[PDB]
Amino acid sequence: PDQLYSTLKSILQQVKSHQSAWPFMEPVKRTEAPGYYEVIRFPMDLKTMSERLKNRYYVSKKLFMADLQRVFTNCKEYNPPESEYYKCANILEKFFFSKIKEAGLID
Ligand SMILES: CN1Cc2ccccc2C1=O
């Protein structure tokens, strides 16, 4: 209940503090990304996730992991594989899986 909240908040904070998190900190701007919102149907970012967390949306580990996973998969679908964004996604995704395992969210 509140142990879930505290674990998620800690995980989410560590992810947001990571050096490769900078591309994901806020919603993608239509302005900077031609045809993003036609192709990416469930956009996600770490600011929206902070809100969802604060709003007590993450009642299960699955809902949290789906959202954060979506951040990475959206990025990898949209961007070229050797783009800096794609590289950041995979670095931070590694970090993400490391932290969820460390906390026994993958039980
Ligand atoms: C994760 N991001 C951030 C961003 C900014 C501009 C264009 C694409 C992206 C993207 O996939």
Side-chain angles (χ1 to χ4, degrees), residues 23-24 26 28-29 32-33 36 71 74-76 78-79 85:
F24 312 109
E26 296 184 75
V28 172
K29 302 174 186 49
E32 329 172 333
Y36 191 91
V71 171
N74 290 349
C75 180
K76 291 187 253 177
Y78 188 73
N79 294 285
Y85 295 143

Side-chain angles (χ1 to χ4, degrees), residues 61 65 100 104-106:
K61 46 189 206 188
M65 291 190 268
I100 61 183
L105 266 40
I106 292 165

